[PDB]
Amino acid sequence: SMITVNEKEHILEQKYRPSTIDECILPAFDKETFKSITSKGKIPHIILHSPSPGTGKTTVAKALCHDVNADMMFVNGSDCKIDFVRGPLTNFASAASFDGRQKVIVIDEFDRSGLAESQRHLRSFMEAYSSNCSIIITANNIDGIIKPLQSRCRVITFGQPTDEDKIEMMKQMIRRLTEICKHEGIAIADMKVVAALVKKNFPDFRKTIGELDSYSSKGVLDAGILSLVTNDRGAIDDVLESLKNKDVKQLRALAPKYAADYSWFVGKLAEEIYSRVTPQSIIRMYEIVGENNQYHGIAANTELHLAYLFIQLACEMQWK
């Protein structure tokens, strides 16, 4: 085959984690920028950041190492404290390589806040040790990496693909999903389903595979499972529909339903009405909901105070 299987594990988005730098689904320029690196043979100081989880960051790190036959220390970013940097990180850099192997240090998920000192400390560690080894950093939020590090490092941002890189990258993944179904023994009756999984989750390939796991429950991806993946989210639809229609009997009825977590429901409402209503009705929905929110918890009957929000909205909110 062309695919890697780890076979030591059952969790399937991790059974199939790519081995080389080729196996990866990356945008054009980035993938090349990576081959080019494994060509010149020695690895520069790199920071890899998503922030969407599961875009390949920590995979592309492990790969660069495989492709350079590097001697690697994989470390938990949250475990890398000042004494680690002084300690087994310096122990490592300074101790000798007769293999003629690029020494690479992978610091995975380095974006924590209290590591500010470990970070300032590394940025210096780099100047003294730079020629023994090299450092690949994985982060979700770059801002959690001190600016003096983003400086000395090549910073490659995953997750923001061009419009064409979106189109190809998904093709590559539809193909990849099908291949995993070949091995795991899943049958594909309707393919529109494998395309659904990929479009639906796109920036994140990890959930994208996971959702392949949970929807294979029966062992076939069929036209019915299509209906589930595709099917249209939020259950605030009943209230949104009643508000458009400006009726009460229905709204009056839904109030006691969401009386349970009011704090959550008010959020999901502000979220989904903001898109579905006119611009100057937007300025009002905040006044209406923002006030209703303030006085909640003063309000005696929560169910009723929720009804009073529904009526207030149906009148003033307008839209198509």
Binding site: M72, P88, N91
Partner: protein
């Protein structure tokens, strides 16, 4: 009941396994790590004349260090613990045997799979070095029909590759290939010579340290490999 510097000794040890302990009437004490990584058991001199749950085992072992050897430990009329020293009396709590993690029964080992031994002297040389050498993971395998231990540093080589340390334990008589990997964190046992019985069935397996005084049984780790 009365506790002897010998047994107060074997307990400070079971404190490095579970912060608490369950001891029921008898000559026999067991404990197990809360996360099930380590199980200890022993038979003792001093005789245990009532049941009780001890939440703090290491701090009460700290408070029994302040009385005379003659001190008389009794359940308190009020159900806690009374330590009567000669000129003095101390009062220490009991928790219910629900909040201390007891094993059910004294887990019997299976028929072993391979067996070697280790001398007291050579246990010292391992523990004591691990600190310096940063050996946090070790492996019992065969080399030249003679079983060796191997120290590694798992953070430096995640792959257990550059072996920083080794100690040859005795001749290997049977014929099987194995790498058993033990986390230095589970090695909690006190020093001295142990008969070593290890067992493996596929994704099953365990290592029993059979001491003179107490027995120790330690979990292997998951990258452990073997055919048995």
């Amino acid at each position: 009941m009365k506790l002897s510097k010998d047994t107060t000794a074997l307990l400070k040890n079971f404190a490095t396994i579970n912060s608490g302990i369950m001891l029921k009437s008898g000559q026999f004490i067991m404990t197990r790590a809360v996360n099930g990584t380590t199980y200890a058991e022993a038979n003792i001199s001093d005789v245990i004349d009532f049941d009780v749950a001890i939440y703090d085992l290491n701090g009460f072992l700290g408070i029994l260090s302040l009385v005379n050897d003659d001190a008389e430990i009794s359940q308190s009329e009020d159900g806690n613990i009374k330590i009567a020293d000669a000129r003095s009396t101390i009062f220490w709590p009991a928790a219910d045997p629900s909040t201390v993690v007891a094993p059910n029964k004294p887990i019997p080992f299976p028929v072993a799979s391979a067996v070697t031994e280790i001398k007291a002297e050579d246990l010292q040389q391992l523990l004591r070095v691990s600190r310096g050498l940063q050996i946090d993971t070790i492996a019992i395998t065969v080399k030249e029909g003679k079983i060796v231990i191997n120290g590694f540093n798992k953070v430096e080589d995640s792959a257990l590759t550059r072996v920083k340390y080794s100690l040859t334990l005795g001749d290997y008589d049977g014929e099987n290939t194995f790498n058993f990997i033990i986390n230095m964190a589970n090695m909690k046992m006190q020093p001295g010579n142990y008969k070593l019985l290890l067992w493996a069935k596929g994704k099953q397996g365990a290592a029993k340290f059979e001491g003179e005084h107490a027995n120790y049984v330690v979990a292997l780790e998951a990258d452990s490999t073997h055919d048995f």
